[PDB]
Design a protein around this motif. Structure first.
Motif, PDB file in Angstrom:
ATOM      1  N   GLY A   1      40.079  35.887  37.000  1.00 15.62           N
ATOM      2  CA  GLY A   1      39.853  37.195  37.405  1.00 15.62           C
ATOM      3  C   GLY A   1      39.370  38.252  36.446  1.00 15.62           C
ATOM      4  N   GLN A   2      39.110  39.672  36.875  1.00 15.10           N
ATOM      5  CA  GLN A   2      38.856  40.508  35.870  1.00 15.10           C
ATOM      6  C   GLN A   2      39.856  41.320  34.886  1.00 15.10           C
ATOM      7  OE1 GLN A   2      35.924  39.985  35.458  1.00 15.10           O
ATOM      8  NE2 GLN A   2      34.546  41.358  36.684  1.00 15.10           N
ATOM      9  N   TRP A   3      39.882  41.184  33.736  1.00 20.87           N
ATOM     10  CA  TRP A   3      40.742  41.745  33.029  1.00 20.87           C
ATOM     11  C   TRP A   3      40.434  43.015  32.126  1.00 20.87           C
ATOM     12  CZ3 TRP A   3      46.049  40.955  32.886  1.00 20.87           C
ATOM     13  CH2 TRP A   3      46.870  40.008  33.722  1.00 20.87           C
ATOM     14  N   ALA A   4      41.276  43.709  31.755  1.00 18.04           N
ATOM     15  CA  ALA A   4      40.931  44.841  30.712  1.00 18.04           C
ATOM     16  C   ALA A   4      41.920  44.780  29.451  1.00 18.04           C
ATOM     17  CB  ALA A   4      40.684  46.111  31.375  1.00 18.04           C
ATOM     18  N   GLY A   5      41.611  44.490  28.268  1.00 13.92           N
ATOM     19  CA  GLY A   5      42.858  44.740  27.248  1.00 13.92           C
ATOM     20  C   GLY A   5      42.876  45.927  26.810  1.00 13.92           C
ATOM     21  N   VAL A   6      44.168  46.133  26.604  1.00 13.24           N
ATOM     22  CA  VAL A   6      44.342  47.432  26.227  1.00 13.24           C
ATOM     23  C   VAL A   6      45.461  47.696  25.035  1.00 13.24           C
ATOM     24  CG1 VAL A   6      45.093  50.073  26.827  1.00 13.24           C
ATOM     25  CG2 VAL A   6      44.066  48.406  28.392  1.00 13.24           C
TER      26      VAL A   6
END
Length: 95
Positions: A46-51
């Motif tokens: 799935g789509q992920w966003a590192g922060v």
């Protein structure tokens, strides 16, 4: 040996939010974080966003299961879905 966790019981979204690399976003309306990685992770589909969090209160340290996305302090490199991120501190409303 140690470095080799698993990313189960978690899945990313389908649409990638309009979040650039190097901005401040609120994860789950908790606190603002600096985005370093954006796209599909390796620990989970799935789509992920590192922060990256300003202080040691995230989840990972940039490396999850051997895969190193971004370089930053430990307990800061928290990963979450793009939609989860926001450009403002929320809480009472999620709209």
């Amino acid at each position: 040996g140690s470095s080799g966790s698993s990313g189960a019981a978690e899945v990313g979204d389908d649409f990638l939010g309009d979040f650039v690399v190097g901005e401040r976003v609120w994860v789950n309306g908790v606190k603002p974080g600096v985005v370093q990685y954006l796209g599909e992770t390796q620990f989970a589909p799935g789509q992920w966003a590192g922060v990256v969090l300003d202080d040691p209160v995230g989840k990972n340290d940039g490396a999850v299961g051997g895969v190193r996305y971004f370089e930053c302090p430990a307990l800061q490199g928290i990963f979450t879905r793009p939609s989860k991120l926001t450009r403002q501190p929320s809480g009472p409303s999620s709209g």
